[PDB]
Amino acid sequence: KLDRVRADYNVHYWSQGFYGIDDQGEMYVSPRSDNAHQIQLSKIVKQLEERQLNVPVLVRFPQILHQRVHSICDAFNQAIEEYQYPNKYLLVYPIKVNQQREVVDEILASQAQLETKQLGLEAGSKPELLAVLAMAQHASSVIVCNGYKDREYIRLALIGEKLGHKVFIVLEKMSELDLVLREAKSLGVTPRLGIRIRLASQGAGKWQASGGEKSKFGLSASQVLNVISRLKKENQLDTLQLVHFHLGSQMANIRDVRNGVNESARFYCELRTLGANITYFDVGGGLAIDYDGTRSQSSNSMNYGLVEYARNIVNTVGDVCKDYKQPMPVIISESGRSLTAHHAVLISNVIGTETYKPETVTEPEEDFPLLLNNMWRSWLNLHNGTDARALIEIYNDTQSDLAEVHSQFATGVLTLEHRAWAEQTSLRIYYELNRLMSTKNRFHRPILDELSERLADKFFVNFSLFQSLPDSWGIDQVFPVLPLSGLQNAADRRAVMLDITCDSDGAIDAYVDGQGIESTLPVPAWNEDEPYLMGFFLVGAYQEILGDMHNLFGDTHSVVVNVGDQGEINIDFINEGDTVEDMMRYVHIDVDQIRKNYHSLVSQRVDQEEQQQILAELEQGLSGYTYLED
Amino acid sequence: LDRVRADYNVHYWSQGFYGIDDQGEMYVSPRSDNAHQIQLSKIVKQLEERQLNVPVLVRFPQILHQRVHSICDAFNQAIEEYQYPNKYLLVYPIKVNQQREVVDEILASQAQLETKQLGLEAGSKPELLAVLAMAQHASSVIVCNGYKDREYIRLALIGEKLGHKVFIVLEKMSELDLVLREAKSLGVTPRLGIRIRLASQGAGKWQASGGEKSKFGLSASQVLNVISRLKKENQLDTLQLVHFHLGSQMANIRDVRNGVNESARFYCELRTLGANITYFDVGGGLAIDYDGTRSQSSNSMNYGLVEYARNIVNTVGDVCKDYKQPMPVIISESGRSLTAHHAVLISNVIGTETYKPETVTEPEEDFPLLLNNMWRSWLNLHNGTDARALIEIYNDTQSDLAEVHSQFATGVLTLEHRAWAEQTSLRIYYELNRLMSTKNRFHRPILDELSERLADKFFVNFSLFQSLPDSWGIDQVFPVLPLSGLQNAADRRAVMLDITCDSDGAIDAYVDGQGIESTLPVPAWNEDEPYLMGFFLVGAYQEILGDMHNLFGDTHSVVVNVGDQGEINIDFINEGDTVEDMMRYVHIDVDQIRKNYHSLVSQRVDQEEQQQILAELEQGLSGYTYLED
Ligand SMILES: *Cc1c(COP(=O)(O)O)cnc(C)c1O
Ligand SMILES: *Cc1c(COP(=O)(O)O)cnc(C)c1O
Ligand SMILES: N=C(N)NCCCCN
Ligand SMILES: N=C(N)NCCCCN
C-alpha cells in the first residue's frame, strides 16, 4: 500500500507542498502557484534522456522561487496588518546563497510583480557587486553592500548610485567611513550609508571589533558613536539611512531572533535620538529551512514557522519604537536560504548495490574448531520456536562468537576459510533474527534497529557528494533523499547511499523519513533490469556554488524546468556539465596533444584491424561526461 | 633577539624546507643540496615585477623531488635493517593533487632513482584518463581503484594493451565478471588486485553489505569467491596484487601495524590457496605532522617516516616468516606525504582592527553607580596594585561589563553608557595585560584570556574556502606565518580573517613554538609597508577542493625552481580568475554587460566624466577577484 508508504516518508513535513508522492507511486513536483499541474520527476528525466542528457542532473523550478518570494512578503505583510505596523517590508536577496543568473532573474521577476514593485539585492564582496550590478542593469534597484571594502569596491558602489541604483554601503569596519567620504567627494556622489552593528546578546566577545572572537564585521558601540560624530561634522548625517545586523545563517531558535531584534531596535532608536534619520532596519539572513521536517531546535531544523518569524520581528521593533516614541522604519530581511532551498533537486541513478543474499549455512566439517561448532549450534536453535528471551541470547552469543573469530584470525589461530564461514553464518543468523523478532516486543526493538543497519543494502549513487552536496560532508547537513519511482514497494528494504568517489566521506550518514532523522532509508528493491532514480531535495541553497572536483568528477548537467498552462514540461535553459577533457584542461594537461600522441602509440602497439576501435574508445572516453554509465 | 626562532619553532613542521634567516625573512630551501635559501618575499617582489599580485600559490617541485627520495630511502633503510628480501615501490595517488605540474615533477623523480620505477594510482574513471595522459611518454605501473563501469574497465584494459602494467583492483564482487568478460572482448590478459576488508579497524568494516560506510573492498567470503572463479576460468595467475587502505592521515602508528598484520595474513592465506600474489599495497595513511608536535591527534602523528616504514616491513616480514613464505613487493600510496610541503599560499594583510589605548574619561555626574564602580577599578590599577588585587580588578570588570550589556538590553542604559563601559573595560584589559606577570601561576591563565581579548584582527586577502578548504571542513590546522620583519614578532598577537563575507572564514588555530595556539605572535602592522603572510603545508588536497564562495576564484599559481647558483626560476604561471571569469561561470553574458554600460553611461553621465567611469567599470570586470591594498 502507497498510503502506508506515505506515512513512512511524510514528505509533506519538509516539502512545503512542492513535492509529494502521487497515486502511481511516483514523486512529483507541483511548482506553479495555481497548483494546477503536477509533474512526475521521472517524466522530466525521461524527457532529458530523449534530448541526450544523462543523469546526474540538477533541476531548477523557477515557479517555486516565485512562490517563496510571495510567501515571505505575505508573511511580513500579515504581521504588519496584525500589529497595524505603520511602514513597509522590503525583501532583499543576498546573492551569496546562490549566484546563478537563472536563479537571480527569477527572484527579480517576482519582486517586480509585488505591490512595492521593488527590486532588492545584497552583495557581500567586490566580485558579487559587479555581478549584482550586471543582473540589475535593466531597472533601478535597492543594492545593499556588505563585506571587506577596498577602494575599487567603494568606487564601483558609488558608480552604481551615480547610474541610478539605490546603493547602500554598509559600514562594517571603522576605517571604511573615511574611505567612503573621500571617494564620494572624488566622484561627486551623495553616498547612502548603512551601519552594521555588533551585538552583545548573541555570545561572548561579539560586541568587540578588535579581539580574537571571530565575528568579522560590524561596528562597536563606541565606533557607531564616532560615525555619527564624523557625519555631523561633515554635514552628512542625512546620508545614514540604514541599520544592519546579521546573526548568521540557519537560526534554529526563535528566541535568538527576538533577542537580536530587541537589541538592534534599541540601537536604531538611540541613533534617531542622536539625530540620525534611519529609514531602513535590515535584520540580515538567518530565516531557517526545515531540512528534516521535525520543527525542532536542532541545527538542521528550526523551532518556528514563517509567520511567527515575521511577528517576532515586527512586534519587537514596534514595541521598542513605542517605548521611545520614535517612528517605525522599513523592515528589510535578507533571507537567501528560505528563498532558494526548495527550488532545486539533484537527480541521479543507483548504478549498483551490495546486498546480503541469504545463502545456506553449510554444516561444520570435522576440521572445524569448537568456536565454529558453537555457531552452528546457535544456527540450529534459531527458528520460529525460539522464545523472545532466547533470540536475544542468540544475538549476544553470535556477536561475541564473531568477535572471537576476528581475534583468532588476527593472531594466526584460524584460516581465511574459517573466518569466511563464520562471517557468512553470522549474517544468516542476523537475517533470521531480523525475521523472528517482533517490533511489538519492547526488548526486540533496539536489536531490530541494530539489525536494520547490519542488513541494509549499500546503494551506489552516480554522483559526487563533494561536487553536488558539499555541506553534507562539511557540516553534516541533512538533505531529504528518496527514490523517485515504484514507491508502492518502499517497504522492501533498508539502504544507505554512497557516492562513486574513492573517498570514505562520500556517503550520506542521515536520512529523512516519516519520523525525522534515521541512519538508513526504507526503499523499493533494486533490480539490475530497471533504472532506479533518486532525488536529493532542498539543495537549492549554497550547494552549487560550494561544490568541488574531488576525484575529477565535475559539474553535473543543469536545467530549468517550467510547467506550462496545460501541463507542458518546458525545459527552458540547459547547462551542459563537464566532460573528462574539461577536467583535464582544468589540471593543465594539453588535451589536443594527448589526442595526437594517442594516434602514434596505437599505430605503434596495436594490430591494424583494432586500431580504429582502440582509438575511438580513447577519444570517446575523453569526450564523455565525467560520471558513469549504467 | 632569536627568542623569535624559538617562539615559532619552524623546523618542527618544516622538515628543513622553510625557516627564518638572519635578516628576519622566511626562506625556502628546496634543493637537496640545500645550497641556496631564497627569501619568500623576493619571490613575491619578482612576481610583482611581472604584474602578478598576491594572493599567490607558489609551488616548489624540488621539494616534491626530495619527498620521493625521502620516502624511498626510508623504506630502503627499513628493508636493509630487517634484510627484507624484496623491494619497495612508491605509487602516487593523483586524488591528492591532480595538477600536471605536480604529477610531472613526481614522475620526473621516478625516472632518476636507479631502480627507475614509480607508479600512479587512479581512483575513478576520469583519473584513469588523466593518469594515462600523464604517463603517455613512458610505460608505467598504474593501480585502478574506485567504482568501475564498463568504460572504466575497458580503458584500463586498453592501458595494458598499450604497454602499461595496469592493476585493476577489485573493490566490489560484481566487478570480477565484468573484468573477465571485457578482457576476453579486447583480447587482453588482465592483471588483478583485490582490496580486502579488515576487521582490525573498527566495527562493521569486515562486511561488504550493511550500513557501515567503508565503500570498497571484498569480504573474506567474496575473496574466496574470486579465487574459486579464477581457478575455474584457469586464470588464477592474473591475480597479482593485494590492496588495503586505512584512510588518510593516520595519527596512530598502532593502527598501521594492526592493519598490516591482518592484511599480511590474507596475503599468506591467499598464497596457501595457490594464488601467486606478487605486490602488497598498503594504501595511503602516511600522515603529515601539521602542528609539529608529533602527537596522536587529528593534525599530527605519533610516529616518524622511517618508523612508518619499519612497521610496514617488519610486520609483513614476520608474518611471512611464520608461514614460511616469500616476501612481496611492498607498495605504498603516500600522496599526502609527497605533496603537503611543496606548496605555500602567500597573500597580504590588507587591513586590521586593533585596539588602540585611549584614556579613560571620568564619568559625567549623570552616570549610574555601576559605571562609577568601573571608574574606581580603573584608578586602582597601576604599578602599585598587588598581584591578587589585579585578579579581582579583572573579575569586577568582567562582571561590570556583563551587567552593562544586560542593562542596555532592557533599556536601563543609553548607547553612550554602553560605549563608555566597553572602552573602559578594554583599557583595563590592556593594562591588566601589562601589569600582570608571566612568572605568576595565577596571572598566566588570565593572560591567556587577555591575549585573545586583545588580539589584533588581521584581514588577509584570500578566501579560506577557495584556498584552504579543509580548515573550514575538518578543522585542519596549517602553519601560518608572516614572511618579513620577524625580528619584531614579539609585537602583538593576531587572528587571521579572510575577506569573504562569511563567519566561518577565519582561522581558529595557529602553530607556534608550543604547537597549537589560538593566537599568533606577530610583528606590528603598518599601513605604509607591505605585510605578507604564508600558509604552509597546503600541498595536499587544498587546491582541488576549493570553491567559489562570494565569487572569489582561483588565485594565481606559479612554479619555482632554485638554480645551482641560486637563480629564482619561475617556470610556469597560471593566472587566477578575474571578476569576468566568475560572472561567466554563473552564466552572465559579460560582453553584453560591457556593452550596456556604454549605453547607460553615455546616456546618464555628464560628458566630461564618461571615459573615467567606463574605464573604472571595465577595469572592474577585467581585474583579479581579490582586493588591492
Ligand atoms: C550570508 C548572508 C546572508 C544570507 O543569510 P541566509 O540566512 O543564509 O539566507 C544574509 N545577509 C548577510 C549579510 C550575509 O552575509
Ligand atoms: C585517498 C587515497 C590515497 C591517498 O592517501 P593519503 O594518505 O591522503 O596520501 C591512497 N590510496 C587510495 C586507494 C586512496 O583512496
Ligand atoms: N555556507 C557557508 N559555508 N557557511 C555559512 C555562513 C553564512 C553566515 N553564517
Ligand atoms: N580531505 C579529504 N576531503 N578527505 C580524504 C579522505 C580520503 C580517504 N580517507
**Which of A536, A556, A578 delimits the end of a domain?**
A578
From A96, A126, A502, residue closest to B95, measured CB to CB: A502
Assess whether the C-beta atom of B472 lies below 6 angstroms from ligand 4.
no
Residue A385 CB contacts under 8 Å (≥ 6 apart), including other chains: none
What is the residue type of B606? D
Q: Which SS3 state, helix, strand or coil, does residue B5 take?
A: helix
Could you tell me if B408 lies within 8 Å of chain A, comparing CB atoms? yes
Retrieve residue A288's grid coordinates: 531557517
Instruction: Report the residue of chain B nearest A352, measured CA to CA.
Output: B174
For ligand 4, the distance from its centroid to the CA atom of residue B247, given in whole angstroms, is 7
Q: Determine which helix (DSSP H) or strand (DSSP E) holds B396, and give its type and residue range.
A: helix B387-409
- Let me know the angle formed at the C-alpha of B473 by B470 and B476, rounded to the nearest 5 degrees: 45
CA dihedral B500, B505, B510, B516 (to 10 degrees): 180
How far is residue A350's CA from residue A528's CA, in Å, rounded to a whole number? 10
Task: Tell me which residue in B98, B124, B593 faces A137 most closely, judged by beta carbons.
Answer: B593
Cβ distance A247 to A286 under 8 Å? yes
Interface check for A293 against chain B (CB to CB < 8 A): the answer is no
Distance CA(B239)–CA(B167), nearest Å, equals 9
- B447 has a chain A CB within 8 A of its CB: no
C-alpha to C-alpha distances, B43 to B345, B528, B627, nearest whole angstrom: 12, 20, 20
| CA distance readout (Å), B409 to A272, A278, A281, B394, B404 | 17, 20, 18, 23, 9
Give the residue from B245, B264, B266 showing the smallest Cα distance to B201: B245
Asked if the Cβ–Cβ distance from A208 to B453 is below 8 Å, we say yes
Residues B293 and B418 in one domain: no
Q: A534 - beta bridge partners?
A: A348, A483
Amino acid at A307: V
Question: Is A496 in Cβ contact with B409 (below 8 Å)?
Answer: no
For residue B239, what are the β-bridge partners?
Answer: B192
Chain A hits for B590, CB-CB cut-off 8 Å, are 134
- Alpha-carbon distance of B285 to B335, in angstroms, equals 9
CA nearest to B487, candidates B131, B26, B17: B26
Find out whether B525 and B352 touch, Cβ atoms under 8 Å.
yes
Rounded Cα gap, residues B226 and B529, in angstroms: 67
Residue at which a domain ends, from B454, B471, B498:
B454
On whether both A547 and A630 belong to a single domain, the answer is no
Q: Work out whether the CA dihedral B106, B107, B108, B113 comes out positive or negative.
A: positive
A298 to chain B, any CB pair closer than 8 A? The answer is no
Start-end of H helices in A97-220: 101-113, 126-135, 151-162, 175-187
Q: CB of B558 within 8 A of CB of B58?
A: yes
Q: For residue A600, with 0-12 CB atoms within 10 Å meaning exposed, 13-18 middle and 19 or more buried, which class applies?
A: exposed
Ligand 1 neighbourhood includes A334 CB (under 6 angstroms):
yes
Listing DSSP states for B312-350 in one string gives: HHHHHHHHHHHHT-PPPEEEE--HHHHHSTTEEEEEEEE
B456 has a chain A CB within 8 A of its CB: yes
* A256 neighbors A304 (Cβ within 8 angstroms): no
- Print the SS3 string covering B86-118: CCEEEEEEHHHCCCHHHHHHHHHHHHHCCCCCC
The minimum-distance atom of ligand 4 relative to the CA of B541 is: 1
* Cell reading at A388: 523472545
CA-based end-to-end distance of chain A:
30
| Distance from the B22 Cα atom to the nearest Cα atom in chain A, whole angstroms | 30
Q: At what angle do helices A62-83 and A101-113 cross, to 10 degrees?
A: 40
Residues linked to residue A28 through DSSP beta bridges, in sequence order: A20, A40
Give residue for cell 573528462.
A580
State the residue range of the domain holding B135. Answer: 61-342
Q: What angle do CA A59, A64, A66 make, to 5 degrees?
A: 130
For cell 517482533, what's the residue? A438
Report the length, in residues, of chain A.
630
Residues A209 and A148 occupy one common structural domain: yes
Q: What are phi and psi of B502, to 5 degrees?
A: -115, 130
Residues A275, A238: Cα–Cα separation, whole Å: 9
B604 and B488 in one domain? no
Per-residue DSSP letter, B551 = G
- 3-state SS assignment for residue B58: strand
Strands A493-499, A457-461: parallel, antiparallel or unpaired by DSSP?
Answer: parallel
CA distance A321 to A539: 39
Collapsing DSSP states into helix, strand and coil, what is residue B462? coil
Nearest to B455 among A101, A212, A628 (CB): A212
Interfacial B residues in 155-194 facing A (CB < 8 Å): 155, 158, 161-163, 172-174
For residue A249, which atom of ligand 3 is closest to its CA? Answer: 9
Place of cell 615533477: B105
Q: What is the DSSP letter of A488?
A: G
Closest Cα in chain B, distance from residue A401 (Å) = 14
Is A344 part of any known ligand binding site?
Answer: no
User: At which residue does the C-alpha cell 614578532 appear?
Assistant: B489
- Alpha-carbon distances, residue B333 vs B77, B80, B87, B108 (angstroms): 18, 21, 15, 17
Distance from CA of A21 to the nearest CA of B (A): 26
Q: Among all chains, which residue has been given the C-alpha cell 634543493?
A: B31
Q: Determine the 3-state secondary structure of A262 from DSSP.
A: helix
**Residue B146 to residue B91: CA distance in whole angstroms:** 16
In this structure, what C-alpha cell is assigned to residue A417? 576459510
Question: Which three three-digit cell numbers place residue B286?
Answer: 602516511
Cis peptide before B328 (omega within 30 of 0): no
Q: What is the CATH number of the domain that holds A553?
A: 2.40.37.10
| CA gyration radius, chain B | 30
Dihedral sign (CA B581, B586, B592, B593) = negative
Contact B583, B590 (CB under 8 A): yes
How would you label A93-131 residue by residue, b for 16+ Cβ within 10 Å and e otherwise? bbbbbbbbbbbbbbbbebbeebeeebbbbbbbbbbbbbb
Centre a 10 Å sphere on the Cβ of residue A273 and count the other Cβ atoms it contains: 13
| Residues A99 and A158 placed together within one structural domain of the fold | yes
Longest dimension (CA), chain A: 101
Distance CA B293, CA A270 (A): 51
Q: Which residue in chain B is spatially nearest to A508 when comparing CA positions?
A: B213
- DSSP code for A13: H
Query: In whole angstroms, what is the distance from residue B495 CA to residue B508 CA?
Result: 8
Neighbour count for residue B390 (Cβ, 10 Å): 20
Cα Rg, chain A, nearest whole Å? 30
Any binding-site annotation on B510? no
Maximum alpha-carbon separation in chain B: 101
CB atoms within 10 A of CB B595: 11
CA distance linking residue B319 with residue B260, whole number of Å: 10
> Least CB-CB distance to B124: which of A205, A473, A501?
A501
Among candidates B467, B354, B363, B456, which has minimal Cα distance to B417?
B363
**Do residues B598 and B492 both lie within one domain?**
no
Which amino acid type is present at position A415? T
User: Which amino acid belongs to residue A256?
Assistant: D
Please give the grid coordinates belonging to residue A328.
517605525
* Identity of residue A45: V
Q: What's A186-201 look like in SS3?
A: HHCCCCEEEEEECCCC
How far is it, in rounded angstroms, from Cα A416 to Cα A419? 5
Which residues of chain A lie closer than 8 angstroms to B127, CB-CB?
551-552
Give the distance from residue A23's alpha carbon to the nearest chain B alpha carbon, in angstroms.
Answer: 30
Query: Measured between CB atoms, does B449 come within 8 Å of chain A?
Result: no
Contacts of A148 in chain B (CB under 8 A): 350-351, 459, 499, 627
Test A96 with B405 for CB contact under 8 angstroms.
no
C-alpha cell belonging to residue A144: 545593499
A629 vs A621: CA distance, rounded Å: 11
Burial readout A369-386 (b: 16 or more C-beta within 10 A, e: otherwise): eebbebbbebbeebeeeb
Shortest CB distance from B145 goes to which of A259, A502, A606? A502
C-alpha distance from residue B519 to each of A214, B293, B429 (Å): 12, 17, 17
Cβ count near B474 (within 10 Å)? 14
For an interface test with A, give the residue of B102, B168, B221, B607 to mutate (most A CBs within 10 A). B221
CA distance B318 to B312: 10
- Across the interface, whether the CB atoms of A152 and B587 are under 8 A apart is answered no
Collect all residues with Cβ–Cβ distance below 8 Å to B359 and sequence separation of at least 6: B427
What is the secondary structure of A545-577 as a DSSP string?
Answer: HH---GGG--PPEEEEEEE-TTS-EEEEEEEPP
Contact status, residue B262 vs residue B200, Cβ threshold 8 Å: yes
Q: What's the CA gap between B396 and B400, in Å, rounded?
A: 6
C-alpha distance from residue A389 to each of A436, A488, B552 (Å): 12, 34, 62
Residues B611 and B512 in one domain: no
Helix, strand, or coil (residue B29): coil
Which chain B residue shows the shortest CA-CA distance from A206?
B453
Please give the helix or strand (H or E) that residue B14 lies within, else none.
helix B11-14
- For residue A590, CA distances in Å to A74, B102, B136 come to 54, 15, 12
Residue B514 CB coordination number (10 Å): 12
Query: In angstroms, what CA-CA distances link A541 with A97, A417, B374, B552?
Result: 6, 51, 47, 18
Q: Does one domain contain both B534 and B586?
A: no
What resolution (Å)?
2.3
Quote the strand ranges of B199-289, DSSP E: 239-243, 279-281
Q: Are A482 and A534 contacting, i.e. CB atoms less than 8 angstroms apart?
A: yes
Q: Report the relative pairing of strands B191-195 and B165-170 from DSSP bridges.
A: parallel
Residues of chain B contacting residue A131, judged by C-beta atoms under 8 Å apart: 551, 579, 582-583, 586, 588
Strands A120-123 and A93-94: parallel
Spatial separation of the C-alpha atoms in residues A123 and A130, rounded to whole Å? 9
Task: Give the CATH number of the domain where residue A412 resides.
Answer: 1.20.58.930
Contact present, A260 and A309 (Cβ < 8 Å): no
Q: Are residues A448 and A557 in the same domain?
A: no
Pairing of strands B329-332, B279-281: parallel
Identify the domain boundary among A343, A375, A391. A343
Residues 571-600 in A contacting B (C-alpha not used; CB under 8 Å): 573, 575, 580, 583-584, 587-589, 591, 594, 597-598
d(CA A209, CA B457): 8
Cross-chain Cβ contact B415/A225 below 8 Å = yes
One-letter amino acid of A129: L
B471 shares its domain with B399? no
CA distance B465 to B550: 9
Distance CA B483, CA B43 (A): 11
Q: Which of A409, A452, A460 is facing B265, going by the closest CB pair? A: A409
Identify each DSSP E strand in B153-217 by its residue range.
165-170, 191-195
Whole-angstrom Cα distance, residue A608 to residue A614? 10
Region of B390 please: left (phi>0), alpha (psi -120 to 50) or beta. Answer: alpha
**Residue A339: strand, helix, or coil:** helix
How far from each other are the two terminal CA atoms of chain B, in whole angstroms? 31
> How many CB atoms neighbour CB A203 within 10 A?
11
Query: For testing the chain B interface, which of A502, A504, A526 should be mutated: the one with the most B CBs within 10 Å?
Result: A502
Q: Is B454 on the interface with A (CB under 8 A)?
A: yes
Residue B597: alpha-carbon gap to chain centroid: 42
Cell of A363: 554444516
- Of A225, A316, A265, A322, the closest CA to residue B418 belongs to A225
How many whole angstroms separate alpha carbon B27 and alpha carbon B38? Answer: 5
Closest CA to A163 of B585, B593, B588: B593
Q: Tell me the C-alpha distance between B182 and A470, whole Å.
A: 35
Give which of A20, A38, A114 is closest to A73, Cα–Cα.
A114
Question: Of B67, B92, B95, which is best to mutate to test ligand 2, by the most ligand atoms within 8 angstroms of its C-beta?
Answer: B95
- Same domain? For A87 and A22 the reply is no
- Output the domain CATH number for residue B597: 1.10.287.3440
| Residues B405-441: b if buried by 16+ CB within 10 A, e if exposed | bebbbeeebbbbbbbbbbbbbbbbbbbbbebbeeeee
* Residue A302 buriedness (CB in 10 A; 0-12 / 13-18 / 19+): buried
Q: How far is CA B429 from the centre of its chain?
A: 35
Within this chain, do residues A280 and A399 fall inside the same structural domain, yes or no? Answer: no
Q: Is A284 in the pocket of ligand 1 (CB under 6 A)?
A: yes
Amino acid at A516: G
CA distance A32 to A441: 46
Give me B134's grid cell. Answer: 600523464
| Of B327, B212, B207, nearest in space to B260 by CA | B327
Looking at the structure of chain A, the number of domains it has is: 4
* CATH number, domain with residue A75: 3.20.20.10
Q: Which residue has the cell 531540512?
A: A291
Are the beta carbons of A250 and A299 closer than 8 angstroms?
yes
Q: Exposed, middle or buried: residue B520 (CB in 10 Å: 0-12, 13-18, 19+)?
A: buried
Distance CA B75, CA A293 (A): 54
CB under 6 Å to ligand 2: residues? Answer: A 502; B 93, 95-96, 121, 123, 145, 245, 248, 283-286, 333-336
Regarding the beta carbon of A246 and ligand 1, being less than 6 Å apart is answered yes
Orientation angle between helical segments A221-233 and A254-273, nearest 10 degrees: 30
Strand pairing class (B492-498; B456-460): parallel
Q: Cβ contact (<8 Å) for B211 and A150?
A: no
